[PDB]
Amino acid sequence: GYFKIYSKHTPINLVRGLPQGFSALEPLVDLPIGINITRFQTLHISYLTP
Amino acid sequence: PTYGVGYQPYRVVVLSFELLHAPATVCGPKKSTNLVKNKCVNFNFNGLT
């Protein structure tokens, strides 16, 4: 019943592909939402241009 | 305002404590004692005794 989010931010100079290396992920936040999750989806930002 | 004592409005609030088979979300106030140092003491830190 706990949703746990771990996060990490790194400055990467690679142009394409998942970089090879090790970096531990510090916990970001735990929430007692207590729901059932089976699917998910990502949302992106859009830049409106003339 | 001139009605009888038993005919006056009472503001009734019923608190219903629901306890399911799920992790709890409401708890009573947690207490704290002054921190003592350099002395064998019985310590409790967030349930770690």
Side-chain angles (χ1 to χ4, degrees), chain A residues 1 4 7-8 14 39 45-46:
Chain A
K4 322 186 67 61
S7 59
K8 186 65 176 176
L14 185 56
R39 302 189 307 175
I45 198 66
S46 303

Side-chain angles (χ1 to χ4, degrees), chain A residues 1-2, chain B residues 23 25:
Chain A
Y2 260 99
Chain B
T25 56

Side-chain angles (χ1 to χ4, degrees), chain B residues 1-41:
Chain B
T2 58
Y3 255 64
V5 183
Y7 277 156
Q8 288 181 4
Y10 285 66
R11 280 179 171 188
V12 183
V13 181
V14 182
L15 300 176
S16 301
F17 306 106
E18 184 188 20
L19 175 66
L20 302 178
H21 280 61
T25 56
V26 184
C27 288
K30 291 302 185 297
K31 302 185 172 182
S32 287
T33 312
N34 183 22
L35 181 68
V36 190
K37 294 179 193 172
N38 307 323
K39 168 191 304 179
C40 171
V41 292

Side-chain angles (χ1 to χ4, degrees), chain A residues 8-22:
Chain A
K8 186 65 176 176
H9 189 145
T10 54
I12 176 59
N13 302 329
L14 185 56
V15 185
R16 186 181 56 86
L18 178 38
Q20 184 173 359
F22 185 80

